[PDB]
Design a protein around this nucleic acid. Structure first.
Ligand code: MG
Ligand code: MG
Ligand code: MG
Ligand code: MG
Ligand code: MG
Ligand code: MG
Ligand code: MG
Ligand code: MG
Ligand code: MG
Ligand code: MG
Ligand code: MG
Ligand code: MG
Ligand code: MG
Ligand code: MG
Ligand code: MG
Ligand code: MG
Ligand code: MG
Ligand code: MG
Ligand code: MG
Lengths: 119, 101, 98, 204, 43
RNA sequence: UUAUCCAUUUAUAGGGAUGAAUU
RNA sequence: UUGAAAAAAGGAGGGAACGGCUUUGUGCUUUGCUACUCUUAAUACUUGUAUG
RNA sequence: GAAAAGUGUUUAAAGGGGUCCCCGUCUCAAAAGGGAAACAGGUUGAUAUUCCUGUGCCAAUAGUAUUAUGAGUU
RNA sequence: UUUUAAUUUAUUCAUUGGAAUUUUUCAUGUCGAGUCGUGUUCUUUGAGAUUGGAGCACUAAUACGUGUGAUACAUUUCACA
RNA sequence: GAUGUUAGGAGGGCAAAUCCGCCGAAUUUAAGCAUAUAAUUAAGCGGAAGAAAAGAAAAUAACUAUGAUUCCUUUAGUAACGGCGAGUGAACAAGGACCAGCUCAAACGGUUAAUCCUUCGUUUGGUGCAAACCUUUCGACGGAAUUGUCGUU
């Protein structure tokens, strides 16, 4: 029934091995079901779940490795890029939006909107 | 000729494409299949809708001690492929049936 | 001889801290101000209009102009791919005669 | 000074030299495909006066438009309604030919770009030729530069298709301010809606 | 008839599957049946 | 005649005196 | 009224190109020796697992 | 042509064949036109020119190296 | 948890750069053309010898200019842009 | 100028109440109907955003004058239009909500494009468990650009 916290520590090969075993077990169960049996029909669900868990663990490991590989370097795969609503991606970064023509900037610096308490 | 500075999309996940477990789902019982097993050493397997003959053969080779001379397939109206697998003369389908279950 | 400085030269000068003037807009200003002494114009520009007025202007302003065969060659004479016109307002005394 | 000179030259238009140039240029355009990129503005000064700049993302497209009215679209010449509405053939469009020109380039050909503006270039009796100034809002050279940057915003997709380019402004009648244009301002349709509006008051 | 496209065959199969009655055990925790003769699939 | 228009073709030799045919 | 087309195949015309191995010089030329060029079928071995 | 659509070489720099030349819109449209090759017997509750036994047929079959099979040339 | 006000602590030393007003000189610059405009057509408007728009023809002026000042025009003020 | 499965990017489709462009009827009203009316509406086609559009005067006034746009209260069912029939019908001012101004082009700076971008980098920081982000200034090698970038107003 193997829960994830055990599996994080395992190396990828070991994980793969585990997964194959689980798959084999599942296949066996399926075969049994197909044949006139209902002894361990309900065992299958758990096995399936276990398999799923294993897959998840492995997938996340793989993703982490990928991320490590493509750390920085301007361009990246579009997977490892910031998946985010298209419009937002298109949109100008806040900094870009801010960026002021030099005269305007100067003006801002000189005559900023002051605080002035009226009495 | 392409020389991309990084690849566009990189599926780091374990392959979704169907392995032996998933391709070939289970043997068939049913009187027909039993008869087949008995008489002409043909094992009947329900398989994935997207199994080819080659693929099925490969699966059978991997999943069991089976060598297959010929594989006929058909798509059942229940959305499964049924693959009739005739074994080479060296093997007795009955023995292999016993082995599998 | 009177080539303008190239990028590297300019950089060096900056670190440390008479030439051809180009660009039709600048050149026209120069001519309008009677600063220019010789202007050399390219034979072909894609909108002829961008330079058509120039020889007439020179004729009015009494400034010497000559239409030279290649735009690319004019560009080469400075550090650009092409150049429309090029002007020499002042000159080193050793060459003034020429 | 140079640009002033060329402005003055182009004001003449029917004068011999200018006329010849126009004749050549229109002839040349007649041959090229209806909408096609040009490397450099044919009227640099005029382009400048609009929005054009020699920044990386700015492009000029020469576009040809048929001159004249557009026959009222109906299967055969016949229209089925009341006589007031019956005529075809002298049906003049609300949009300018310039607007049409910019529309056709902006829409399907350069959906990626943003139409900035457009200027006249040449005409024959069959076609009017405009150069339309467009800009790539994803080119960083344009993204960064704070003046111009505005066009990178999403509110400016297909300005040409909403009548927001100069030509659009013209035919919406926003070029004319004043008592002459009172009825169209936030927009003609909008104005109409406002005028129709019955405001009730919960209390009344 | 006796020469279907695969898609059509699959659809037919689906329809057949849909046809079958509520599994009786569920009833302890149907109106969309169709008889092949009276109501057509209209494929 | 250069705009424009039409035709023709693989845009195939500038103007005059019942076989084969290709490297 | 004279009664489809094309994929595909074939035939002909034509005469491009022309043995192999070893040695020398800058795919080409020169020098020396005689099993050669095809052809099906089987078999073996690398090349992604070479039959539907 | 505002587009939606309407037309399909009308003024194109429109993939194949040989060792640079020579061809040349693409694509769909036939379960009665064109077209590689199959017959018999047996067998199932329900399939069969499709499984079984037998007997064939068609198309592929990369290179290199042996073998054999025959031709041709000395 | 989100941010955005008030309040609390700034003090020394470096210098490149810029800004505003203020004197005093000299510069009287530049100001968007097949565009405006007129004609004519059609549309649209409450817009009336045409309100805006559009097609076509013709096609300007440079700030002493040109455009509005809801009746076509001329001659000319003035105001406003 | 073509050409590229060259390196990097963008568009395409869905959705629409408000919104922006076109395109565009007729029923209807006029006790008939033809201009009008319905209506610059419905449908059609295209295009945006959290709002859109408009917007910093070639504006209104004729005053002791106001001062971008938008919206509300009004002006006003008024001026006006109209087989002066049916019917349609604003604007300025006034009172508010809200209030924000600006930059290109042109002028000027050539004792030098000061600009700008791509790729490759380099090394201080900040929050994060990581993932990512956030900023910091520094060069190169490319280009772009004198058919005009940047500063000055
Ligand atoms: Mg089959
Ligand atoms: Mg119309
Ligand atoms: Mg059928
Ligand atoms: Mg029936
Ligand atoms: Mg076909
Ligand atoms: Mg047939
Ligand atoms: Mg039967
Ligand atoms: Mg002006
Ligand atoms: Mg009307
Ligand atoms: Mg007035
Ligand atoms: Mg779209
Ligand atoms: Mg009536
Ligand atoms: Mg009635
Ligand atoms: Mg009636
Ligand atoms: Mg609608
Ligand atoms: Mg806006
Ligand atoms: Mg109001
Ligand atoms: Mg009243
Ligand atoms: Mg009305």
């Amino acid at each position: 029934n193997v829960k994830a916290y055990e599996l994080r520590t395992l190396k990828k090969k070991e994980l793969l091995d585990k997964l194959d075993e689980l798959k084999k077990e599942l296949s066996g169960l399926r075969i049994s079901k197909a044949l006139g049996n209902s002894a361990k029909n309900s065992k299958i669900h758990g096995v399936r779940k276990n398999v799923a868990r294993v897959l998840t663990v492995y997938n996340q490991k793989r993703k982490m490795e990928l991320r490590q590989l493509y750390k920085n370097k301007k361009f990246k795969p579009y997977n490892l890029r910031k998946k985010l609503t298209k419009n937002k991606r298109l949109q100008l970064s806040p900094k870009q939006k801010a960026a002021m023509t030099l005269r305007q900037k100067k003006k801002v610096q000189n005559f900023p909107q002051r605080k002035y308490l009226v009495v | 000729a392409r020389n991309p500075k990084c690849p566009r999309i990189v599926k780091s996940c374990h392959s979704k494409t169907l392995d032996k477990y998933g391709l070939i789902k289970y043997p068939l019982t049913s009187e027909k299949a039993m008869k087949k097993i008995e008489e002409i050493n043909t094992l009947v397997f329900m398989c994935d809708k997207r199994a080819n003959k080659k693929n099925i053969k490969k699966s059978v080779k991997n999943l069991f001690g089976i060598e297959c001379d010929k594989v006929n397939v058909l798509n059942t109206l229940n959305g499964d492929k049924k693959a009739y697998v005739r074994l080479s003369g060296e093997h007795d389908a009955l023995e292999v049936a016993n082995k599998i279950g | 001889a009177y080539k303008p400085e190239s990028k590297t030269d300019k950089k060096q000068r900056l670190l440390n801290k008479l030439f051809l003037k180009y660009g039709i807009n600048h050149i026209t200003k120069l001519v309008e101000n009677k600063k220019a002494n010789l202007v050399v114009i390219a034979n072909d520009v894609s909108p002829i209009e961008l330079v058509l007025f120039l020889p007439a202007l020179c004729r009015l302003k009494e400034v010497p102009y000559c239409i030279v065969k290649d735009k690319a060659t004019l560009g080469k004479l400075v550090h650009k791919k092409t150049a429309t016109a090029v002007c020499l307002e002042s000159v080193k005394k050793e060459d003034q005669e020429k | 000074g140079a640009y002033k000179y060329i402005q003055e030259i182009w004001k003449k238009k029917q004068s011999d030299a200018m006329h010849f140039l126009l004749r050549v240029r229109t002839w040349e355009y007649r041959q090229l495909p209806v909408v096609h990129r040009v490397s450099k503005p044919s009227r640099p000064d005029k382009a400048r006066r609009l929005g054009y700049k020699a920044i990386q993302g700015f492009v000029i497209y020469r576009v040809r438009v048929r001159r004249g009215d557009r026959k009222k679209r109906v299967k055969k010449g016949i229209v089925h309604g009341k006589p007031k509405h019956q005529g075809v053939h002298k049906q003049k469009s609300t949009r300018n030919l310039k607007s049409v020109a910019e529309g056709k380039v902006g829409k399907s050909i350069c959906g990626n770009l943003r139409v900035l503006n457009s200027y006249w270039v040449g005409q024959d009796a069959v076609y009017k030729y405009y150069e339309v100034i467009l800009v790539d809002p994803n080119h960083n050279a344009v993204r960064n530069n704070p003046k111009i940057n505005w066009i990178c915003n999403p509110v400016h997709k297909h300005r040409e298709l909403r009548g927001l380019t100069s030509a659009g402004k013209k035919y919406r009648g926003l070029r004319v301010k004043g008592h002459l244009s009172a009825k169209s301002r936030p927009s003609i349709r909008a104005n109409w809606k406002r005028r129709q509006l019955i405001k009730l008051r919960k209390c009344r | 008839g006796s020469i279907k496209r695969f898609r059509l065959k699959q659809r037919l199969g689906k329809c057949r599957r849909q046809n079958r009655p509520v599994p009786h055990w569920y009833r302890l925790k149907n109106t969309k049946r169709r008889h092949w003769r009276r109501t057509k699939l209209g494929l």
